Amino acid sequence: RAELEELEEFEFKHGPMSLINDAMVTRTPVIISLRNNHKIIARVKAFDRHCNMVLENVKELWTEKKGKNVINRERFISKLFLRGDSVIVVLKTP
Amino acid sequence: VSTPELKKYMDKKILLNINGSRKVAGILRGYDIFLNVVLDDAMEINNHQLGLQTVIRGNSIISLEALDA
Amino acid sequence: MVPPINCIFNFLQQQTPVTIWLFEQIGIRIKGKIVGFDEFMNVVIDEAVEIPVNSKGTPLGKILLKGDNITLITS
Amino acid sequence: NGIPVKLLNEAQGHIVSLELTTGATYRGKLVESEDSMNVQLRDVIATEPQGAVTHMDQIFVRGSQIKFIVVPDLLKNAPLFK
Amino acid sequence: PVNPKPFLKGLVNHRVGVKLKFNSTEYRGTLVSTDNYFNLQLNEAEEFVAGVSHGTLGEIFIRCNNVLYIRE
Amino acid sequence: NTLYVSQLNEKINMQRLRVNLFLLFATFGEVLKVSMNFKKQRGQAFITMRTIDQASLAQISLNGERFFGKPLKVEFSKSETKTL
Amino acid sequence: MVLFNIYDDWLDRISSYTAFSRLTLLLRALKTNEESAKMILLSDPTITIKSYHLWPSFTDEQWITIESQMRDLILTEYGRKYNVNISALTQTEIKDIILG
Amino acid sequence: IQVAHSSRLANLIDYKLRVLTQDGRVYIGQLMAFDKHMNLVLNECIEERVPKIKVEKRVLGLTILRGEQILSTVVEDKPL
Amino acid sequence: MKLVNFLKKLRNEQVTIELKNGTTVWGTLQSVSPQMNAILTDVKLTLPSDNIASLQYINIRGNTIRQIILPDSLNLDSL
Amino acid sequence: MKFTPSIVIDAPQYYVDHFNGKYNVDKCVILRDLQLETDSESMPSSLKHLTHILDLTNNDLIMIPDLSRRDDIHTLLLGRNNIVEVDGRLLPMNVQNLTLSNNSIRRFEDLQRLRRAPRTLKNLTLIGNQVCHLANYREHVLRLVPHLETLDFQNVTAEERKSA
RNA sequence: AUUGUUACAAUACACAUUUUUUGGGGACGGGAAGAGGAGACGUCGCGACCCUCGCAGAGUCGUUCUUGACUUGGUCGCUUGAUGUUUCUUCUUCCCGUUC
């Protein structure tokens, strides 16, 4: 009961989410992508098992125009709680 | 857990309707709880053959009208 | 009758030819031979080749395809 | 257990319509039911959004892709709830 | 004989090539590790958007649901 | 309470007919019945009201009233309605 | 005993006194309201904190802007607190900044 | 539109709710039953369509809706 | 253990949400559950920039919720 | 008494008219025999709650008053009233099913508000009045109010239209 | 002059295919006329020379002043009615409403 769930806590630091964990520990920026042609930038704070993260300094970048002329919109958000399904790829910049 | 009633449709040709416009067809050999239909025939669509046997996945399998009622 | 669990085993035993189908792209279809056995739908496919079928030779090694992505398999 | 499932089970041998993800409207009898909504039909008409209608003899539907399964006005109050 | 998980394990500390369905971008880099849910962790990542590279990422991570296949 | 109509235009549609009936009967009192139960058409419609007085009034006033060409034959129902 | 250069990359660009002043401004702001200060610091996530720095490495103009923001925060918070009518001059606000 | 401060789905049973699909086809019906996946039994489903300007209407079934494609339910008006 | 725990702890906060459609909706969470089943008290809406077409009472499924915007900026999940 | 907000509030908005839509309001203690002598004032108290079916029959309403959006009062019943003239720009698209039976519409020129109906009134019926007895009245109606589908229970045919 | 037993739900686990974690004076509107939108597939309506002719979700029975069990609008016009797939390629004049 306890040991089954408790053993899975250390699995984050060993596997694929190790990097994420590290980032969370030592606050640094990370480019988070999305399904509908979106690109978010933020520094992590908390973390979870199924990639249900929460970050600060949320700089969003997404298009809302036709194929002929692009338009890079911007908006400064913070303290969001994004779902793990939409999160495609993350990376800790130096 | 609860097994679907595929015993009634066993040993009979069925015109399948897969996801994303694909009218496949073949006789049902085996079945399971996850809906991975082990069929023993395949023919795309006009008509043209492409391999005899074909074990399809459970997700991509919406419609399946039986030829012989 | 032939079940999905034993099917995998059979495939492993034999190492026969296969033509995998994709979900998103209709034209681009994989071609190779299955190898690995597992509980989920995901299994190793040796000597992969993504051919562009009609409504032609993609470069790739031993493709370990995903469980959800696979649309078809012949054996 | 699920109430909807129970209701479905109860309605066995009745004219139940359907609606898929793509939008293929059906209308026929109910063969059987289960925990997972695996519906089977008999004398099932096909009036799809594509236009080209048809009249199918039999058809088995997947529960995941189904949007909503229709049901008659008889089984409203009793004898499913209490 | 050679299973999928085993293969994956073998491939750790070696070059890997993953491609996603939605927005097809070939991610090229050295594989670090993997879990039971089939999550990816790459090093020296190069997001090849249909051949042409966007930019050299470095260290990176990838979800299980997006990816299609894994190759050399 | 209920008032069984007869001798009306069958050529008109069902829902429309019902609507018309509702419109007609709102002057006398509150019409309880929303839709027709028989589904046969050609006059046979049971206008269910809240009050009996209202129903009576309707019977009195709309006896042989011009509705879609023909004169409607108003009359009191034999059995009581399922809703009432 | 741990060692930290609190002037993470300021001494080469600006003088020592200036650096000290900046630190004071930051620290005071943090004290007043920490979350706000943090937000101010990390407005642009591209301006990242280094592996051996306590603060984000801004350009000179950027730094100035940040300082200004901090000052504003300090003022605003003060106003909220003590219901003062208005700051008379910049030299009156110096006292507020330094001493408290 | 009348709507009190409801706590949960159990308290708001037997009420006329508008349901939104994944594709964006608006519905409307009385919520009869509840479930684990939120398969709400509609008393009489009046479906509506909007082309990819103006909303259409229909009246096919009194269906038991599925939980996968459902976006969010919204109360229209109380009964009785 | 889970990130949903944190969500559950919060209540009566005017939190926005970037849904699958794209329209914002800033309202009270009310009774948040295990499967992210939020219940809006009062929020904005833009039916398919964002136009003005809001509704008062509402109830949302957790599958649709792609994000939960901030109301009270505070980090305290464990307890 | 006069149609106030309090009266509206009091009114029974529980039993919905199940033929179409919801909330069949009946203003005051009962709209049927409310005796609203003046025009329908304080319409804002309802605030477009709901076809709506605001059954304001058996009243003494001099003129038909509306104040709401395009979907607020489709099946309005104003039977047995003293409706002299019903000109207005508020209820443009909504009021389709107009039950104006036993009204006091005397002349054909009194229906000029409803007439020029291409933009003035998107839909309107009107029947069972003094103007119905006048010579060539139906024809006139057809000419002016083309949107009037059902003219006193009988439909406006193509032949009729041609004639007018 | 409450305690005991039994049954069913809620709370306590919950990333792999049937489900909550991945298949994205000038503008505007309507109607009519003139000059250089159209064809299929269905799905509901306005008229009728037509059909059809009546009182009851329907029928049967047990028991008692109202309840338990067992069975299973069709056709033709539209003489310019509405509406979703699916292929191809506007200007002038008058009348009526809204806005400045």
Q: CATH no. for residue C45?
A: 2.30.30.100
Task: Give B11-53 as a 3 state SS string.
Answer: CCEEEEEECCCECCEEEEEECCCCCCCEECCCEECCCEECCCC
Taking the C-alpha atoms of residue I68 and residue A54, their distance in angstroms, rounded to an integer, is: 9
Closest chain H residue by Cα to residue J46: H1
Which residues on chain H are in Cβ contact (under 8 Å) with J16? Answer: 77, 79
Q: Are the beta carbons of D26 and D41 closer than 8 angstroms?
A: yes
Q: Choose among J115, J112, G33, A51: nearest CA to I4.
A: A51
Q: Which amino acid is at B11?
A: D
Q: Are the beta carbons of I16 and I46 closer than 8 angstroms?
A: no
Q: What is the DSSP letter of A80?
A: B
Taking the C-alpha atoms of residue J149 and residue D30, their distance in angstroms, rounded to an integer, is: 42
Residue I1: give the domain boundaries.
1-79
Q: What is the DSSP letter of B67?
A: S
- Name the token pair of J33: 């025999």
Taking the C-alpha atoms of residue C2 and residue B52, their distance in angstroms, rounded to an integer, is: 16
Taking the C-alpha atoms of residue F64 and residue F76, their distance in angstroms, rounded to an integer, is: 14
Residue J56: give the domain boundaries.
1-164
Q: How far is CA E36 from CA A86, C43, E21, E72, G60, in A?
A: 20, 14, 21, 21, 48
Taking the C-alpha atoms of residue E61 and residue E58, their distance in angstroms, rounded to an integer, is: 10
Could you tell me the residue ranges of all domains in chain F?
Answer: 1-84
Taking the C-alpha atoms of residue B64 and residue D44, their distance in angstroms, rounded to an integer, is: 12
Taking the C-alpha atoms of residue B67 and residue D59, their distance in angstroms, rounded to an integer, is: 9
Helices and strands in chain A: count of H runs, count of E runs = 2, 5
Calculate how close chain I gets to G46, using CA atoms only, in Å. Answer: 21
Task: Give chain I as a 3 state SS string.
Answer: CCCHHHHHHCCCCCECCCCCCCCCCCECCCCCCCCCCCCCCCECCCCCCCCCCCECCCEECCCCCCCCCCCCCCCCCCC
Determine phi and psi for C8, rounding to 5 degrees: -60, -45
Residue D19: give the domain boundaries.
1-82
Nearest CB partner across the interface for I73, out of A53, A79, A86 = A79
Taking the C-alpha atoms of residue F6 and residue D14, their distance in angstroms, rounded to an integer, is: 33
E62 touches A: beta carbon within 8 Å: yes
Taking the C-alpha atoms of residue D71 and residue J26, their distance in angstroms, rounded to an integer, is: 34
Q: Choose among I36, I45, I39, I42: nearest CA to I64.
A: I36
I73 touches G: beta carbon within 8 Å: yes
Assess whether the previous peptide bond of D79 is cis (omega < 30° from 0).
yes
Q: What is the DSSP string of A29-64?
A: EEEEE-SSSEEEEEEEEE--TTS--EEEEEEEEEE-
Q: Are the beta carbons of H17 and H3 closer than 8 angstroms?
A: no
Taking the C-alpha atoms of residue E11 and residue D50, their distance in angstroms, rounded to an integer, is: 47
Q: How far is CA G36 from CA A25, A67, A78, D58, H69, in A?
A: 21, 39, 11, 66, 40
Taking the C-alpha atoms of residue I29 and residue I34, their distance in angstroms, rounded to an integer, is: 13
Taking the C-alpha atoms of residue F4 and residue F48, their distance in angstroms, rounded to an integer, is: 9
SS3 G70: helix
Determine phi and psi for C63, rounding to 5 degrees: -80, 115
Which residues on chain A are in Cβ contact (under 8 Å) with E40? Answer: 16
Residue A66: give the domain boundaries.
1-94
- Name the token pair of F33: 């019945």
- Name the token pair of I14: 């005017």
Taking the C-alpha atoms of residue J79 and residue J128, their distance in angstroms, rounded to an integer, is: 10
CATH code of the domain in which E56 resides: 2.30.30.100
Query: What is the distance, to the nearest Å, from the Cα of residue G36 to the centroid of all Cα atoms in its chain?
Result: 11
Task: Give chain H as a 3 state SS string.
Answer: CCCCCCCCCCCCCCCEEEEECCCCCECCEEECCCCCCCCCEECCECCCCCCCCCCCCCCCECCEECCCCCCEEEEEECCC
Q: Are the beta carbons of D20 and D66 closer than 8 angstroms?
A: yes
Query: Is any atom of nucleic acid chain K found less than 7 Å from the CB of residue B17?
Result: no
Element (H, E) at E47: strand E40-49
Determine phi and psi for J163, rounding to 5 degrees: -60, -50
Taking the C-alpha atoms of residue H61 and residue H44, their distance in angstroms, rounded to an integer, is: 6
Taking the C-alpha atoms of residue B54 and residue B52, their distance in angstroms, rounded to an integer, is: 7
Cα B36–Cα B41–Cα B47 angle in degrees, nearest 5: 120
In chain J, where do the E strands start and end?
150-151, 154-155
SS3 F31: strand
The β-bridge partners of D46 are D26, D54
Q: How far is CA F44 from CA F69, F74, I17, I42, in A?
A: 16, 10, 55, 49
Q: Are the beta carbons of G75 and G82 closer than 8 angstroms?
A: no
- Residue A59 makes CB contacts below 8 A (sequence gap 6+) with A40, A41, A42, A74, A75, A76, G44, G45, G46
Q: Are the beta carbons of E3 and C44 closer than 8 angstroms?
A: yes
The β-bridge partners of C64 are C44
Taking the C-alpha atoms of residue A87 and residue I18, their distance in angstroms, rounded to an integer, is: 13
Q: Are the beta carbons of D45 and D27 closer than 8 angstroms?
A: yes
Cα D37–Cα D39–Cα D42 angle in degrees, nearest 5: 170
Query: Is any atom of nucleic acid chain K found less than 7 Å from the CB of residue B57?
Result: yes
Q: Are the beta carbons of G42 and A43 closer than 8 angstroms?
A: yes
Classify residue A29 as exposed, middle or buried by CB count within 10 Å of its CB (0-12, 13-18, 19+). Answer: buried
Q: Choose among H69, H14, H7, H77: nearest CA to H41.
A: H14
Taking the C-alpha atoms of residue A42 and residue I18, their distance in angstroms, rounded to an integer, is: 16
Element (H, E) at C33: strand C28-34
Domain count, chain A: 1
- Enumerate residues preceding breaks in chain D (C to N > 2.5 Å): none
Taking the C-alpha atoms of residue J147 and residue J115, their distance in angstroms, rounded to an integer, is: 10
Domain count, chain J: 1
Element (H, E) at A77: strand A72-77
* 8 Å CB contact of C2 and B38: yes
Q: Are the beta carbons of B28 and B6 closer than 8 angstroms?
A: yes
The β-bridge partners of A38 are A62
- Return the number of other C-beta atoms located less than 10 Å from residue B35's C-beta: 22
Buried b / exposed e along F38-64 (16+ C-beta atoms within 10 A)? eeebeebbbbbbeeeebbbebeeebee
Taking the C-alpha atoms of residue E52 and residue E48, their distance in angstroms, rounded to an integer, is: 5
- Residue D41 makes CB contacts below 8 A (sequence gap 6+) with D26, D28, D29, D30, D31, D56, D58, D59, D60, D61
- State this model's resolution in angstroms: 3.8
Taking the C-alpha atoms of residue A28 and residue A25, their distance in angstroms, rounded to an integer, is: 9
Q: Which amino acid is at J125?
A: T
Q: Are the beta carbons of J136 and J161 closer than 8 angstroms?
A: no
Taking the C-alpha atoms of residue E40 and residue G16, their distance in angstroms, rounded to an integer, is: 47
Q: How far is CA J103 from CA G3, G11, I41, J26, J89, in A?
A: 95, 92, 46, 19, 21
Nearest CB partner across the interface for I60, out of H22, H24, H72 = H72
Q: What is the DSSP letter of B56?
A: -
Taking the C-alpha atoms of residue J113 and residue J88, their distance in angstroms, rounded to an integer, is: 8
Query: What is the distance, to the nearest Å, from the Cα of residue J41 to the centroid of all Cα atoms in its chain?
Result: 15
Q: Which amino acid is at E12?
A: V
Taking the C-alpha atoms of residue J15 and residue I19, their distance in angstroms, rounded to an integer, is: 36
- Name the token pair of F84: 């009432």
With distances taken from each CA to the C1' atom of nucleotide K84, the closest residue turns out to be D49
Q: What is the DSSP letter of F80?
A: P
The class that CATH gives domain F1-84 is alpha beta
- CATH code reported for the domain at B1-69: 2.30.30.100
- Name the token pair of F42: 């050609």
Element (H, E) at J144: helix J137-144
Query: Is any atom of nucleic acid chain K found less than 7 Å from the CB of residue J119?
Result: yes
Structure-determination technique: cryo-EM
- Name the token pair of G100: 């408290």
Q: Which amino acid is at H60?
A: L
Taking the C-alpha atoms of residue J147 and residue J126, their distance in angstroms, rounded to an integer, is: 12
Could you tell me the residue ranges of all domains in chain H?
Answer: 1-80
Q: What is the DSSP string of D18-56?
A: E--SS--EEEE------SS---EEES-EEE-TTS--EE-
Q: Are the beta carbons of D48 and B62 closer than 8 angstroms?
A: no
Query: What is the distance, to the nearest Å, from the Cα of residue I3 to the centroid of all Cα atoms in its chain?
Result: 14
SS3 A93: coil
Pairing state between β B38-39 and B25-30: antiparallel
Nearest nucleotide by C1' position to the E22 CA atom = K24
Taking the C-alpha atoms of residue E30 and residue B57, their distance in angstroms, rounded to an integer, is: 31
Kindly tell me whether chain I and chain H come into contact, counting contact as 3+ Cβ pairs under 8 Å: yes
Q: How far is CA A42 from CA A38, D78, G71, I67, J21, in A?
A: 13, 55, 25, 14, 48
Q: Choose among G36, H57, E56, F71: nearest CA to A79.
A: G36
- Name the token pair of A65: 């125009």
Domain count, chain D: 1
CATH code of the domain in which D49 resides: 2.30.30.100
CATH code of the domain in which A72 resides: 2.30.30.100
Residue to test with chain H: of J23, J24, J68, J71, most H Cβ within 10 A: J23
- Name the token pair of E41: 């962790």
Its sign, for the CA torsion H62, H66, H72, H78, is positive
Taking the C-alpha atoms of residue A26 and residue A93, their distance in angstroms, rounded to an integer, is: 12
Phi-psi region at H23: left, alpha or beta (left = phi > 0; alpha = psi -120 to 50): alpha
Taking the C-alpha atoms of residue C50 and residue C22, their distance in angstroms, rounded to an integer, is: 10
- Residue B56 makes CB contacts below 8 A (sequence gap 6+) with B16, B18, B24, B36, B37, B39, C71, C72, C73
The β-bridge partners of J15 are none
Q: Are the beta carbons of I41 and I27 closer than 8 angstroms?
A: yes
Q: What is the dihedral of CA I58, I60, I66, I71, to 10 degrees?
A: 50
Taking the C-alpha atoms of residue B22 and residue B57, their distance in angstroms, rounded to an integer, is: 14
SS3 G50: coil
Q: Which amino acid is at E45?
A: A
Classify residue E35 as exposed, middle or buried by CB count within 10 Å of its CB (0-12, 13-18, 19+). Answer: middle
Q: Which amino acid is at G39?
A: M
Taking the C-alpha atoms of residue J129 and residue J81, their distance in angstroms, rounded to an integer, is: 10
Kindly tell me whether chain J and chain B come into contact, counting contact as 3+ Cβ pairs under 8 Å: no
Query: What is the distance, to the nearest Å, from the Cα of residue F3 to the centroid of all Cα atoms in its chain?
Result: 6
Query: Is any atom of nucleic acid chain K found less than 7 Å from the CB of residue F76?
Result: yes
The β-bridge partners of B14 are B26, B66
Which residues on chain I are in Cβ contact (under 8 Å) with H50? Answer: 48
- Residue G63 makes CB contacts below 8 A (sequence gap 6+) with G22
Instruction: Please tell me which chains touch J, using 3 or more CB pairs under 8 Å as the contact test.
Output: F, H
Q: What is the DSSP letter of B7?
A: S
Q: What is the DSSP letter of F7?
A: S
I60 touches A: beta carbon within 8 Å: no
Q: Choose among B17, B7, B41: nearest CA to B27.
A: B41
Buried b / exposed e along J132-164 (16+ C-beta atoms within 10 A)? eeeeebbebbbebbebbebbbbbbbeeeeeeee
Pairing state between β D68-69 and H64-65: antiparallel
Determine phi and psi for B28, rounding to 5 degrees: -80, 120
The β-bridge partners of H72 are H20, I60
Q: What is the DSSP letter of J10?
A: H
Its sign, for the CA torsion E18, E20, E26, E28, is negative
Taking the C-alpha atoms of residue D3 and residue E29, their distance in angstroms, rounded to an integer, is: 51
Residue E21: give the domain boundaries.
1-72
Pairing state between β D45-47 and D54-55: antiparallel
